[PDB]
Amino acid sequence: MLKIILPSLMLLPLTWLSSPKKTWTNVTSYSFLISLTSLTLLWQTDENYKNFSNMFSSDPLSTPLIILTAWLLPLMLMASQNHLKKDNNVLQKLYISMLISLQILLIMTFSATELIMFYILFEATLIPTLIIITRWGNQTERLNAGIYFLFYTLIGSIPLLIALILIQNHVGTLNLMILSFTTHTLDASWSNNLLWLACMMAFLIKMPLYGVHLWLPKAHVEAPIAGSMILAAILLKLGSYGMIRISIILDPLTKYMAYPFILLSLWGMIMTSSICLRQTDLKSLIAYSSVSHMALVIASIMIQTPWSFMGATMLMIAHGLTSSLLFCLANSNYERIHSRTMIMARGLQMVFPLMATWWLMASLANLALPPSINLMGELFITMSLFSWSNFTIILMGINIIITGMYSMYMIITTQRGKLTNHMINLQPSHTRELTLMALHMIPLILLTTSPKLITGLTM
Amino acid sequence: MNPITLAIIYFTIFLGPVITMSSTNLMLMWVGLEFSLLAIIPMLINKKNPRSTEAATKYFVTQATASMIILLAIVLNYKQLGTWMFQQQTNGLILNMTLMALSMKLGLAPFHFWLPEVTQGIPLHMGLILLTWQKIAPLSILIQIYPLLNSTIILMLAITSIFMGAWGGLNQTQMRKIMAYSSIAHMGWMLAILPYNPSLTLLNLMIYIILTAPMFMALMLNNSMTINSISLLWNKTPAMLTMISLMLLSLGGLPPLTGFLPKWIIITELMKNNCLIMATLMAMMALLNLFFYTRLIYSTSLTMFPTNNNSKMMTHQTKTKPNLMFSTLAIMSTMTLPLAPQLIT
Amino acid sequence: QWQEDPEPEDENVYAKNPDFHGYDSDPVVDVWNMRAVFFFGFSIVLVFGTTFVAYVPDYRMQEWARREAERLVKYREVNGLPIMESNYFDPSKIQLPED
């Protein structure tokens, strides 16, 4: 991993030692080249996972998440340029450094071999995330959004820290490979049931689980666009990735311990998807859509089947690209009229025909049109849950209906109908903006062509 | 003060703790604590206003009372065993009043009420001495008798200090009072681990000191006594915004900053001794500290509060501060977690 | 009232530079930022990254496994052995409890 991490660290001096007129062109270009180098992790010609050293590894679960992380950094930079163009030069460089910091921290997080190392990097990400939300968010509610985000995470993370220390005191190590091979059955004591919850809650809050999700709609509505991109695409996946790594040592208590969280997720995914039908704020709508999708990820990880893990891995990647695309699409209208109210701008297909095409594909991805990886992940999750209990299809069926309703509702409301023609400041789409949309959507199509790369650990 | 007075008084402030740390005899340790009390009073009251007089008086009566209780324990032990050091055979009540009186000297809760008031009434550079240099002598005594101390009293003092340091700091708009509550919370962590691993007490003391010293220097740069005063930093000395933010997050124990290390290691050691419930309670309520530090970070570097017209005249003036000790401590208090194995053993 | 700037007015980015690409107000900086994104993002990463992934051989030993399966199916059938047995481990290698 050092041949990926070291060049990423060199982006920081590159940012600060570049001329003001070359900073964006420089950092974006090398960020693309670093994404290219991360593809080396996909050269996997056997079934032994790559252990580069005692500290860094990569297997079929972390490899897609590392590459998606590397790809997001250039995309976030392009997304940020227009709304930062009034900041002075030092403030622009500070913002870029925050974005690089997350890229470095997240790549290290997904390749860490030891759980307290994962925990430290997992917690470190809050610092640049909070700074981005609160220093560059637009509204007065960005400060409250920062508090919710930081402290929903932290209250769950403290029990996680206790559990990790406890496991290490008992086993002698937090190395993941050794924990895997030497794992032994747990007794079903009250003490072990609290251990299960301490190991799971921080990851479940991060997903977020329905019930403790209020931080996420707040954080998205208030964050700048690059903050929304990283939060929806990668940061939520830390919880799902954490749950998959740590659940190997929690057997057999997950068989009964999972029931309340399957119930919250399967019912909760209907509550949050139905909220999207009556949401007046476009960013909030996309955010609630994420909570509904991540509810599926929670359910499939909880039932721990080969299909359920594979469907969760695909959905994690597919949602990452799709939701980041939707935030970028919404931000392009906001940068023109400076409102997130969905019903304000209307008939936009009349004036932005190619941007409306990007809107349609993002919406078709979101409602899981086959053969997209969006549908493939949701399909295999549905099959595994049906096996777990045939009555799950009732709640799946309701969510599928509602997801089509709000996905097409967003398109009809904003792109169709009569143009709101008092909006004479609807400047034509930027080349940068149209390029940004394509950089989301080409990988989604390419991954649909070769879905072996995101199947995860079980297939 | 003229130079002769400064030299004598500062020398006595330095001398007392050195006597306490080097003494075999418990009476000479008490003498060292006596030098500290006597020498620091004229510095506390140097500026001579009603608030500084109140602060010096409250400090004197608390410290002198605690000193008498410590002396009682020393004398009772001399009566019991004919020696001038505490032993394994020292009566447990004698050791419990030593712990009580030293914790009152340190300002641990529930003997804490004086400390936020005295810190508020004195100059910032004296608050710095009060919360750093003056902790060393009473802690040094405790570390010597760590196998003799009662774990029950310690943990109750420790959890109480963390709880009241947290809730105490939540209501403050005065910087000197926020630092005092930050002191009490960190002393709660130092004390909790003392009977188990006194080396980790010293690790926490060192990291607390190198966090607190540059935080006081940052307040001293413009004499920022309140949240609203420190919120003008963006206009007066914006270059400090990065390091104040990281020092505040380090004081709150957020990873990957150096201040995460003391909380992390103490939890590890407490749970090696099955002190799981206290460690959980301690770590959970320490998050409340991060809340009021974050609110402080919100008003300094992450938003820009309204400024005033006279501040433009300040921008015309050159400053000669901070000294380069600020940068050294600021960097080592925030960016040294990668060197954690070299700090614990 | 306090002393505060008025809000800035809406600006049309294309009024001064009708060839604006979205990257910069300086035209020359703008076009080169556009070219770098298209060259490194698309010409390099998306084309060569796609090519490199396409020619990763035997990804996760899927080609070897099918090749190995055909060898075993062939072997197990000429010799009359079962294609696949219920017991992964030979029972002779296992010592069950007496009870």
Partner: peptide
């Protein structure tokens, strides 16, 4: 619209003796 920054009413909530 311009980024919101604290106004007098926001800053005055730290001007009290306590929070």
């Amino acid at each position: 619209a311009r980024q919101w920054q604290p106004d007098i009413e926001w800053a005055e909530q730290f001007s009290g003796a306590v929070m």
